[PDB]
Amino acid sequence: ATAILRPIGLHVEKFQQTYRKKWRFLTSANANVILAEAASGERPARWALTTGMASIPWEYLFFYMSPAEYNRMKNYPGTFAKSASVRIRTWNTRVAFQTGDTQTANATLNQNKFLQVAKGIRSIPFICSTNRKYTYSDTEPMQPTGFATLTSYEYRDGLKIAMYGYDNDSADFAKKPPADATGAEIYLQDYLTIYTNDARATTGTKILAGFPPYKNFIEEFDASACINTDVVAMDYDFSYAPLVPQFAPVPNNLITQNYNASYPAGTKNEVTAVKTTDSSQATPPTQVRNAPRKYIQGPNADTTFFDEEQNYLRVPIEQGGIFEEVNVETVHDTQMPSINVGIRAVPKLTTIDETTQANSWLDAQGYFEVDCVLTTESVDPYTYIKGGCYSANTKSQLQYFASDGRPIAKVYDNPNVYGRMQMIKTVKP
Amino acid sequence: FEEVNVETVHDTQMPSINVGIRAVPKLTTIDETTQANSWLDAQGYFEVDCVLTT
Amino acid sequence: ESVDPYTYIKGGCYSANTKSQLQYFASDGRPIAKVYDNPNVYGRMQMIKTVKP
Amino acid sequence: ATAILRPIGLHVEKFQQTYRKKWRFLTSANANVILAEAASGERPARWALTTGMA
Amino acid sequence: AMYGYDNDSADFAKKPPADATGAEIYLQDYLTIYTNDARATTGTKILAGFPPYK
DNA sequence: CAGGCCAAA
DNA sequence: TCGAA
DNA sequence: CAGGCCAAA
DNA sequence: TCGAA
DNA sequence: CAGGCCAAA
DNA sequence: CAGGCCAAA
DNA sequence: CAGGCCAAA
């Protein structure tokens, strides 16, 4: 029999977008030295071991998309980041012909140059590491002598301004010609740092294990043979990266009496849980279901995380485990692999009278060409005939919140805890 | 220009040509995420052949 | 079909000015549009002033 | 020679959308009759011939 | 610079013609990209920055 | 990948 | 076709 | 040799 | 399977 | 070898 | 085109 | 046999 109607279902429009950037980065070949970091609050006294492996911030949205693209993206509710890709090529590595010292005839045409690549060091459970900005000595510019006070947020903000420039009405407009326009090189300042405990003032039983042998977890190549070659190629598929919240549904409490109904979940976990661990071992690991949560669209929505533009440069793109959907969901913890690349410090051609590492270095600089692609997807659903887009309420989203109203998000800036990236309260910009 | 006959005329322009060398940053450290603020002297050498027929 | 063009780095979408559009207007400020409701004139659909809803 | 930059041009995103409807219409089989329409302003007096073609 | 001065010029020796010598000439005209300066603009400002000319 | 626009061909 | 195919 | 541990696969 | 095979 | 120019096609 | 969501498969 | 005329194509 002829069918005059068939179940065609909803009209839903899906939109895929792609964002590409090309960056050229300059890195300094820092010496590996030990710096003391004094105790401060809950931070214990510790030793820090510096490197020249600059952090590549491929985990953040500004790395892939301009302020104009970001501003336009807010007009597409339900936008999810789907995949991110990065390719790193190295160019010729420059090493100074001589050092500043005049007493030694240290100039030499012969060079030994080495390129260092570290993938996924951030997640190694027994290596405590972060990316830090150093201060350097005036006589030895390759030698860190302390820590800059710049935060990770401020570092990424400065990188973003270098990439995309100021507003046309800024008094400081001329200070940063946008590399997205010129294609000029940008200096990176955030370097992989390895920590270990400082037991000088420790009372009772001391842990005297020294350092982890972190060189056993990096790749090091002859830089003379890597000119104009790819050294890193990484692809990442996001688990849950909601960049713009979904369209709100038509609220069923306006239509139904049973809007606050209950139903079986069986043995399935449909509400996520928060895991807390304690490496001091004063308390055992705990798992708590039904964390404080807020809807991010709809009647009582709290959109602070998206209103504050946290996901542009302050927090990583991947946020799996931080958000919930009201359906029968399966959620796991997430983290993107870290990327650090750089040039090993080049010792100055001179004699020393002891069996030690070098104490003076030649100026050396890495030149890295970075390609990056980000793909996203958004939806325009029409559940109802009038009044714009509305999604099914099974698409409704929630976000972890703290009791003071601050949204909670994943952060990659702190060292891993049991190989995990912690989630912390966001800070208002 | 016009000619008095039954003419067909459109707007014109020749394509522009610009060539050069990108600035070469000086080998030095700076303490911020910016472009270079000091450069090495660098110079492009271009050999140009040109033919015009009339 | 619609387009999101990015001619500039900041401040949202901007198109090339060769995409700029104009519409016929009457002297009283009413936009002019085609209408199909009137009979054809020499086989043509006339354009008339729009009326405010 | 290896090209570090190529003219990729602008980023432009194109979006195609489709709209479907199904309608069922009832029409009346009108008689073809002649109605007089009186003159009004610039409208001249005329005869009108009706149809059932909706 | 290409073709030199007249033989009676007081400045004749200053520019030996490159059409005769084949020597190199320095160019001084460079591509420049403009954008609006909204520091003193009143009302609605256009804050789009620069076009990505690279 | 240039010549009266490019997101058209 | 006052490019020119 | 990267993504919720690696000494598991 | 909120990577994905 | 002519018809909106011929030195254009 | 139905059974714990569909815009997922 | 419809879309800037049809008795033109």
XYZ file of C-alpha atoms (C1' of nucleotides) in Angstrom:
699
model
C 0.000 0.000 0.000
C 1.151 3.514 -0.841
C 2.501 5.392 2.174
C 1.519 9.054 2.327
C 3.631 9.524 5.482
C 6.827 7.820 6.627
C 8.825 8.376 9.830
C 11.433 10.786 8.459
C 12.141 11.997 12.008
C 13.654 15.318 13.050
C 15.397 17.861 10.897
C 18.921 18.206 12.307
C 21.709 20.131 10.584
C 25.328 19.154 11.267
C 28.171 21.611 10.654
C 31.841 20.635 10.405
C 34.559 23.295 10.626
C 38.352 23.145 10.300
C 40.940 25.518 11.781
C 44.562 25.639 10.600
C 47.581 27.604 11.798
C 51.300 27.611 11.052
C 53.751 28.785 13.715
C 57.530 29.182 13.794
C 59.073 28.918 17.257
C 62.546 29.701 18.587
C 63.857 27.763 21.589
C 66.936 28.357 23.726
C 69.384 25.531 24.432
C 69.257 25.797 28.222
C 71.818 24.150 30.457
C 70.621 21.359 32.739
C 71.239 22.865 36.191
C 69.753 22.361 39.647
C 67.722 25.165 41.224
C 66.388 25.228 44.772
C 62.696 26.042 45.208
C 61.893 26.952 48.804
C 58.859 25.656 50.667
C 55.703 27.760 50.390
C 52.398 26.793 51.979
C 51.584 23.245 50.916
C 54.524 23.246 48.483
C 57.492 21.413 50.046
C 61.096 22.435 49.584
C 62.375 20.753 46.445
C 65.165 20.663 43.887
C 64.449 21.530 40.254
C 66.414 20.285 37.239
C 66.168 22.539 34.192
C 66.033 21.576 30.513
C 65.798 23.172 27.089
C 62.724 21.164 26.023
C 60.149 23.859 25.306
C 56.478 23.097 25.880
C 54.301 23.046 22.751
C 50.804 24.242 23.830
C 48.841 22.124 21.348
C 46.274 21.357 24.075
C 44.659 24.816 23.917
C 42.153 26.350 21.539
C 44.116 29.526 20.737
C 46.879 27.353 19.246
C 44.490 26.460 16.409
C 42.056 29.345 15.999
C 42.149 33.134 15.863
C 40.054 35.485 18.034
C 37.720 36.104 15.075
C 37.171 32.371 14.584
C 36.608 31.923 18.324
C 34.124 34.807 18.484
C 32.166 33.382 15.549
C 32.212 29.865 17.030
C 30.025 31.053 19.928
C 27.125 31.293 17.459
C 27.015 27.479 17.046
C 25.547 25.802 20.143
C 26.573 22.200 20.608
C 30.048 22.665 19.148
C 32.428 19.824 20.023
C 36.106 19.629 19.194
C 36.553 16.363 17.305
C 40.261 15.976 16.507
C 43.494 17.931 16.831
C 46.638 17.357 14.790
C 50.123 18.832 15.111
C 53.217 18.397 12.933
C 56.619 19.760 13.962
C 59.480 20.324 11.524
C 62.930 21.527 12.568
C 65.127 23.856 10.535
C 68.851 24.576 10.874
C 70.016 24.836 14.483
C 72.145 27.919 15.146
C 75.121 27.709 17.516
C 77.269 30.698 18.426
C 80.738 30.806 16.892
C 82.248 31.871 20.228
C 81.317 32.846 23.762
C 81.569 36.274 25.363
C 84.695 35.441 27.369
C 87.850 37.010 25.929
C 90.545 35.311 28.036
C 89.885 31.906 26.435
C 90.364 31.467 22.682
C 87.217 29.362 22.570
C 85.932 30.050 19.036
C 85.597 26.925 16.894
C 83.990 26.022 13.570
C 83.305 22.427 14.673
C 79.940 21.681 16.281
C 78.089 18.879 18.037
C 74.362 19.689 18.088
C 71.612 17.487 19.526
C 67.826 17.808 19.286
C 65.717 16.514 22.182
C 62.133 15.252 21.856
C 59.946 14.229 24.809
C 56.463 12.795 24.198
C 54.075 12.124 27.064
C 56.491 12.867 29.915
C 53.718 14.730 31.752
C 51.801 11.508 32.460
C 54.700 9.341 33.718
C 53.769 8.513 37.340
C 57.283 8.448 38.832
C 58.563 11.618 37.120
C 57.416 14.833 38.798
C 57.584 17.560 36.152
C 56.020 20.830 35.024
C 56.799 23.520 32.469
C 58.440 26.606 33.961
C 59.840 29.917 32.795
C 63.356 30.553 34.065
C 65.461 33.581 34.808
C 68.992 33.395 33.434
C 72.402 34.712 34.392
C 73.803 37.669 32.485
C 77.248 36.111 31.976
C 75.814 32.705 30.948
C 72.568 33.349 29.029
C 72.018 29.595 28.592
C 72.193 29.052 32.360
C 68.964 29.300 34.383
C 69.479 30.873 37.802
C 65.908 31.063 39.103
C 62.211 30.975 38.303
C 60.122 33.708 36.736
C 56.880 34.465 38.556
C 54.757 34.377 35.377
C 51.862 31.946 35.650
C 50.860 29.437 32.987
C 47.761 31.509 32.197
C 49.875 34.635 31.692
C 52.388 32.716 29.573
C 49.684 31.396 27.250
C 48.052 34.837 27.110
C 51.348 36.393 26.027
C 51.776 33.673 23.417
C 48.267 34.395 22.129
C 48.942 38.132 21.884
C 52.157 37.381 19.989
C 50.208 35.169 17.574
C 47.232 37.458 16.975
C 48.153 40.981 18.118
C 46.312 43.738 19.955
C 43.073 45.538 19.193
C 43.341 48.424 16.735
C 42.637 50.945 19.531
C 45.323 49.649 21.911
C 48.074 52.007 23.014
C 50.483 49.048 22.706
C 49.363 48.019 19.207
C 52.761 48.383 17.528
C 54.576 46.238 20.110
C 53.383 42.847 18.768
C 52.920 42.469 14.999
C 50.764 39.339 14.729
C 52.667 36.258 13.608
C 49.402 35.021 12.078
C 49.791 37.960 9.677
C 53.574 38.168 9.245
C 54.653 34.566 9.721
C 57.569 35.758 11.848
C 59.299 33.672 14.500
C 58.168 33.685 18.146
C 60.365 32.877 21.147
C 59.110 30.199 23.535
C 59.866 30.568 27.244
C 58.294 27.542 29.013
C 60.615 24.579 29.566
C 60.314 21.073 30.986
C 61.531 20.950 34.597
C 62.138 17.825 36.705
C 61.649 18.011 40.473
C 62.914 15.955 43.395
C 62.588 16.372 47.143
C 64.918 18.622 49.138
C 65.779 16.763 52.349
C 68.192 19.359 53.764
C 65.686 20.364 56.463
C 63.697 17.109 56.608
C 63.402 15.586 60.083
C 63.028 11.880 60.699
C 63.349 9.412 57.838
C 64.730 11.003 54.675
C 64.124 9.913 51.095
C 67.540 10.138 49.435
C 66.769 8.682 46.004
C 68.222 11.583 43.997
C 66.566 12.104 40.610
C 64.708 9.838 38.212
C 66.817 9.059 35.136
C 64.656 11.176 32.843
C 67.051 10.890 29.883
C 65.797 7.305 29.485
C 62.388 8.670 28.423
C 63.373 11.116 25.651
C 64.628 10.803 22.094
C 67.807 12.666 21.185
C 69.001 13.058 17.593
C 71.968 14.582 15.793
C 70.677 18.063 14.957
C 73.135 18.380 12.061
C 71.188 15.625 10.279
C 67.651 16.794 11.137
C 67.602 19.996 9.059
C 64.228 20.411 7.313
C 62.773 17.157 8.675
C 59.666 16.200 10.625
C 60.434 15.226 14.215
C 56.953 15.061 15.775
C 53.596 14.078 14.277
C 50.723 13.687 16.735
C 46.977 13.182 16.301
C 44.401 13.253 19.097
C 40.689 12.402 19.019
C 38.738 14.130 21.775
C 36.524 12.197 24.174
C 34.400 15.136 25.355
C 35.436 18.668 24.341
C 32.292 20.828 24.503
C 33.285 24.252 23.191
C 29.754 25.723 23.084
C 26.884 24.252 25.150
C 24.078 22.420 23.345
C 20.782 24.135 22.536
C 18.491 23.880 25.541
C 15.539 21.473 25.320
C 11.928 22.431 25.824
C 11.611 21.893 29.609
C 9.216 19.023 30.324
C 8.310 20.406 33.761
C 6.154 22.883 31.818
C 4.237 19.983 30.225
C 4.394 17.054 32.656
C 3.705 16.342 36.311
C 6.370 13.607 36.561
C 9.354 15.770 35.533
C 11.180 14.763 38.748
C 10.582 11.031 38.250
C 12.845 8.157 39.268
C 13.621 4.978 37.352
C 15.998 2.014 37.680
C 19.645 2.321 36.752
C 20.296 -1.373 37.364
C 23.956 -2.149 37.961
C 25.129 0.505 35.487
C 26.762 3.718 36.670
C 24.901 6.564 34.962
C 26.156 9.358 37.247
C 29.897 9.976 37.268
C 32.134 9.916 40.332
C 35.119 11.879 41.627
C 38.235 10.011 42.766
C 40.518 11.509 45.417
C 43.939 10.035 46.180
C 46.649 10.942 48.686
C 50.297 10.254 47.863
C 51.238 11.165 51.441
C 49.155 8.056 52.317
C 47.457 9.714 55.294
C 44.116 8.661 53.751
C 43.203 5.961 51.298
C 41.705 6.527 47.835
C 38.022 7.467 47.841
C 35.340 7.566 45.145
C 32.308 9.850 45.511
C 29.283 9.778 43.216
C 26.800 12.642 42.695
C 29.256 15.541 42.795
C 28.033 19.162 42.874
C 26.956 19.863 39.307
C 25.250 22.611 37.314
C 23.414 22.562 34.014
C 25.136 24.575 31.280
C 21.987 25.294 29.272
C 18.323 25.559 30.154
C 16.332 27.090 33.013
C 18.795 27.170 35.945
C 21.898 27.128 33.741
C 25.297 28.267 35.003
C 27.370 29.225 31.957
C 30.250 30.838 33.883
C 32.866 28.533 32.350
C 31.816 29.487 28.814
C 30.956 33.122 29.580
C 34.490 33.611 30.936
C 35.989 32.067 27.754
C 38.024 29.624 29.854
C 38.516 27.141 27.018
C 40.294 29.581 24.683
C 43.675 29.616 26.451
C 43.268 29.016 30.203
C 42.166 25.359 30.271
C 42.824 22.496 27.813
C 40.450 21.532 25.020
C 39.927 17.989 26.314
C 37.573 17.959 29.310
C 36.324 14.351 29.358
C 35.228 13.372 32.858
C 34.250 16.936 33.782
C 30.879 16.989 31.975
C 27.819 14.748 32.179
C 24.861 14.061 29.920
C 21.537 12.954 31.376
C 21.344 9.798 29.231
C 22.818 6.361 29.947
C 26.414 7.510 29.571
C 29.866 5.940 29.705
C 32.597 8.317 30.878
C 36.320 7.868 31.490
C 39.154 10.141 32.579
C 41.117 11.963 29.881
C 44.395 13.750 29.228
C 46.262 14.755 26.094
C 49.903 13.687 25.668
C 52.466 16.395 26.342
C 54.973 17.583 23.736
C 58.365 19.106 24.542
C 61.131 19.720 21.997
C 64.409 21.600 22.172
C 68.165 21.656 21.676
C 70.660 20.321 24.203
C 73.039 22.894 25.667
C 76.332 23.127 23.767
C 79.378 23.253 26.090
C 81.915 25.992 25.478
C 85.245 24.801 24.079
C 87.406 25.152 27.188
C 89.216 23.087 29.787
C 88.053 22.506 33.349
C 90.066 20.835 36.088
C 87.464 18.456 37.561
C 85.205 15.628 36.425
C 81.980 17.610 36.116
C 79.575 18.748 33.463
C 80.294 21.987 31.635
C 79.849 25.273 33.498
C 79.855 27.531 30.414
C 77.857 27.175 27.218
C 77.602 28.548 23.708
C 74.455 30.363 22.649
C 72.309 27.935 20.677
C 68.790 28.147 19.299
C 66.214 25.731 17.913
C 64.029 26.626 14.929
C 60.733 24.725 14.814
C 57.983 24.921 12.190
C 54.620 23.868 13.638
C 51.528 22.931 11.632
C 48.277 22.467 13.525
C 44.752 21.501 12.472
C 41.600 21.411 14.606
C 38.257 20.010 13.447
C 34.946 20.672 15.198
C 31.267 19.812 14.788
C 28.018 21.462 15.894
C 24.305 20.694 15.522
C 21.102 22.668 14.901
C 18.236 20.431 16.114
C 14.550 21.181 15.540
C 12.449 19.217 18.016
C 9.619 21.774 17.851
C 7.864 23.673 15.083
C 8.292 27.226 16.449
C 10.729 29.385 18.381
C 14.130 28.280 17.121
C 16.278 25.245 17.778
C 15.647 22.868 20.679
C 17.440 19.614 21.400
C 16.163 16.456 23.025
C 16.576 16.639 26.793
C 18.807 13.551 26.611
C 21.386 15.982 25.164
C 21.287 18.155 28.300
C 24.740 18.772 29.777
C 26.093 19.316 33.286
C 29.492 20.457 34.549
C 31.290 19.805 37.825
C 31.122 22.832 40.117
C 32.689 23.839 43.408
C 30.565 24.942 46.355
C 31.545 28.603 45.885
C 30.118 28.557 42.365
C 33.393 28.220 40.480
C 33.274 25.719 37.595
C 35.751 22.846 37.847
C 37.990 21.964 34.907
C 40.926 19.756 34.028
C 44.353 21.415 34.109
C 47.635 20.195 32.620
C 49.939 22.671 34.380
C 50.381 20.702 37.612
C 52.401 17.475 37.901
C 50.482 14.247 37.484
C 49.062 12.416 40.494
C 49.296 8.651 39.954
C 49.587 9.394 36.250
C 46.397 11.489 36.274
C 45.660 15.105 35.426
C 43.868 16.677 38.374
C 40.729 18.784 38.112
C 40.695 22.096 39.978
C 38.494 25.133 40.427
C 38.666 27.639 37.602
C 39.723 31.201 38.406
C 37.849 34.231 37.125
C 39.948 36.030 34.440
C 40.978 55.424 -24.203
C 38.168 55.154 -26.745
C 37.997 54.532 -30.474
C 35.113 55.899 -32.527
C 34.156 52.483 -33.948
C 31.852 49.856 -32.435
C 34.201 49.035 -29.571
C 34.283 46.622 -26.643
C 36.221 47.914 -23.633
C 36.891 46.471 -20.183
C 38.845 47.599 -17.135
C 42.494 46.567 -16.873
C 45.342 46.169 -14.404
C 48.654 44.340 -14.485
C 49.501 41.888 -11.683
C 51.914 43.196 -9.072
C 55.264 41.549 -8.323
C 57.072 41.757 -4.982
C 60.076 39.633 -4.001
C 62.480 39.778 -1.084
C 64.197 38.043 1.815
C 62.622 37.556 5.231
C 64.389 39.297 8.108
C 66.923 37.062 9.867
C 66.696 37.284 13.687
C 69.913 37.883 15.584
C 71.158 34.905 17.597
C 70.281 36.092 21.101
C 67.901 35.396 23.956
C 64.880 37.496 24.874
C 62.763 37.082 27.988
C 59.244 37.263 26.510
C 57.142 35.483 23.903
C 57.538 38.000 21.086
C 59.085 38.236 17.671
C 62.736 39.213 17.399
C 63.723 42.811 18.136
C 67.201 42.644 16.556
C 68.187 41.339 13.142
C 71.211 40.399 11.084
C 71.981 42.333 7.924
C 70.713 40.311 4.975
C 70.423 41.063 1.277
C 68.646 39.559 -1.718
C 70.308 39.345 -5.135
C 67.846 39.226 -8.036
C 68.591 38.944 -11.757
C 65.736 40.359 -13.846
C 65.185 39.759 -17.561
C 62.509 41.807 -19.295
C 61.194 41.907 -22.863
C 58.666 44.322 -24.373
C 57.178 43.978 -27.858
C 55.355 46.772 -29.682
C 23.826 28.057 1.399
C 25.644 30.543 3.639
C 29.273 31.554 4.207
C 31.470 32.487 7.181
C 34.439 34.427 5.728
C 37.516 35.436 7.726
C 39.318 38.265 5.949
C 40.821 39.542 9.217
C 42.473 37.944 12.228
C 40.286 39.474 14.975
C 36.726 40.560 15.669
C 34.612 37.944 13.918
C 33.731 37.320 10.301
C 34.287 39.910 7.572
C 33.778 39.454 3.850
C 35.601 41.033 0.946
C 33.984 44.332 -0.005
C 33.315 42.904 -3.477
C 30.593 40.887 -1.694
C 28.841 44.062 -0.503
C 25.148 44.140 -1.417
C 22.658 46.883 -2.268
C 18.875 46.854 -2.630
C 16.540 49.057 -4.651
C 14.781 51.598 -2.436
C 11.994 54.116 -2.875
C 12.471 57.772 -1.971
C 10.345 57.427 1.181
C 12.708 54.767 2.512
C 10.601 51.728 1.665
C 12.590 48.826 0.177
C 11.488 47.725 -3.291
C 10.822 44.058 -4.031
C 9.421 41.831 -6.741
C 5.783 40.779 -6.331
C 3.889 37.986 -8.089
C 0.376 39.007 -7.020
C -0.258 41.532 -9.801
C -0.838 40.598 -13.457
C 2.212 40.556 -15.686
C 3.204 43.622 -17.697
C 4.641 42.561 -21.063
C 5.268 39.163 -19.507
C 7.203 40.695 -16.596
C 6.698 40.668 -12.844
C 6.705 44.256 -11.616
C 8.682 45.508 -8.636
C 6.831 47.644 -6.093
C 7.409 49.298 -2.746
C 7.175 46.973 0.226
C 4.617 47.747 2.930
C 5.462 47.694 6.620
C 3.791 44.656 8.302
C 63.266 24.247 -2.929
C 61.165 23.477 0.132
C 58.314 25.939 0.629
C 57.687 26.927 4.239
C 54.681 29.040 3.175
C 52.219 28.622 0.312
C 49.264 30.834 -0.650
C 46.500 28.873 1.084
C 44.295 31.988 1.035
C 41.363 32.770 3.313
C 39.543 30.450 5.646
C 35.915 30.406 4.480
C 33.296 27.991 5.808
C 30.331 27.078 3.595
C 27.107 25.723 5.099
C 24.391 23.941 3.116
C 20.933 23.420 4.627
C 17.813 21.625 3.379
C 14.181 22.268 4.338
C 11.374 19.793 3.615
C 7.618 19.958 4.140
C 4.633 17.829 3.168
C 1.215 19.451 2.768
C -2.234 18.099 1.917
C -4.559 20.622 0.282
C -8.288 20.581 -0.449
C -9.614 22.561 -3.416
C -13.183 23.385 -4.406
C -14.422 22.715 -7.941
C -15.611 26.255 -8.651
C -17.890 27.085 -11.547
C -16.486 29.278 -14.312
C -18.697 32.377 -14.038
C -18.305 36.044 -14.934
C -18.140 38.631 -12.149
C -18.130 42.395 -12.600
C -15.391 44.336 -10.807
C -16.186 48.044 -10.666
C -13.644 50.762 -11.378
C -11.646 52.007 -8.390
C -8.912 54.622 -8.647
C -6.489 53.520 -11.347
C -8.265 50.154 -11.636
C -10.611 50.189 -14.654
C -13.981 48.492 -14.738
C -13.441 44.917 -15.854
C -15.012 41.485 -16.146
C -13.585 38.561 -14.178
C -13.848 34.887 -15.144
C -13.553 32.490 -12.212
C -11.899 29.065 -12.083
C -11.238 26.237 -9.657
C -7.459 26.209 -10.238
C -6.056 26.901 -6.780
C 70.373 54.652 -12.055
C 69.601 52.452 -15.070
C 70.482 54.922 -17.823
C 72.577 57.733 -16.316
C 72.700 61.492 -16.787
C 73.244 63.624 -19.865
C 76.870 64.162 -20.867
C 76.655 67.854 -19.872
C 75.267 67.235 -16.372
C 77.242 68.466 -13.384
C 76.243 65.219 -11.618
C 77.267 62.910 -14.478
C 79.796 60.856 -12.507
C 77.373 60.092 -9.660
C 75.393 57.368 -11.499
C 77.276 55.109 -13.929
C 74.468 53.571 -15.994
C 73.699 49.969 -15.097
C 72.582 49.498 -18.711
C 76.255 50.060 -19.578
C 78.049 48.460 -16.617
C 75.633 45.733 -15.572
C 76.223 46.654 -11.932
C 73.767 46.007 -9.116
C 71.120 48.566 -8.106
C 69.513 48.848 -4.668
C 65.715 48.808 -4.529
C 63.968 50.910 -1.885
C 60.191 50.390 -2.357
C 58.629 47.672 -0.203
C 55.195 46.105 0.192
C 53.333 47.616 3.156
C 50.075 46.358 4.698
C 47.710 48.857 6.320
C 44.938 48.571 8.889
C 42.806 51.158 10.645
C 44.002 52.992 13.756
C 41.044 53.173 16.146
C 42.869 54.887 19.026
C 40.996 58.155 18.401
C 37.905 56.701 16.697
C 34.596 57.733 18.267
C 31.491 55.588 18.161
C 31.643 52.048 16.810
C 35.205 50.814 16.324
C 36.423 48.212 13.852
C 38.850 46.062 15.843
C 39.660 43.349 13.300
C 43.452 43.689 13.539
C 45.294 42.765 10.340
C 44.506 40.501 7.409
C 46.624 37.335 7.504
C 48.724 38.382 4.521
C 51.220 35.523 4.936
C 47.929 30.308 -6.508
C 48.917 36.930 -11.682
C 44.546 40.184 -15.594
C 39.064 44.563 -13.356
C 35.923 39.658 -6.890
C 36.042 34.797 -5.050
C 33.585 32.232 -1.169
C 32.228 31.993 -8.847
C 34.643 28.586 -12.329
C 37.528 39.340 -27.627
C 40.965 46.295 -26.421
C 44.512 38.941 -23.075
C 42.742 34.799 -24.806
C 41.318 30.890 -24.861
C 58.277 4.486 22.744
C 51.656 9.737 23.169
C 45.474 8.877 25.628
C 43.620 8.250 32.728
C 49.862 2.765 35.311
C 53.381 -0.565 33.425
C 56.769 -3.986 35.546
C 49.902 -5.360 32.111
C 49.202 -6.222 26.788
C 33.109 2.971 22.982
C 32.624 10.383 25.527
C 39.653 7.718 20.907
C 39.190 3.464 18.676
C 40.173 -0.326 17.268
C 37.367 41.333 -51.643
C 29.373 43.085 -49.493
C 26.426 43.660 -43.495
C 27.426 49.082 -38.612
C 36.097 49.716 -39.002
C 40.294 47.105 -40.612
C 45.491 47.845 -40.262
C 40.929 43.015 -36.174
C 39.691 37.925 -37.631
C 12.016 3.491 11.302
C 10.212 -0.772 18.385
C 13.959 -2.222 23.756
C 16.287 2.514 28.895
C 18.876 9.012 23.718
C 20.089 10.026 18.766
C 21.990 14.198 16.185
C 25.680 7.694 18.406
C 26.019 3.144 15.449
C 3.926 22.833 -23.187
C 7.472 26.470 -16.420
C 12.379 31.013 -15.898
C 11.987 38.132 -17.744
C 7.911 37.357 -25.394
C 6.760 33.842 -29.047
C 4.494 34.020 -33.792
C 12.055 33.391 -31.978
C 14.676 28.700 -31.149
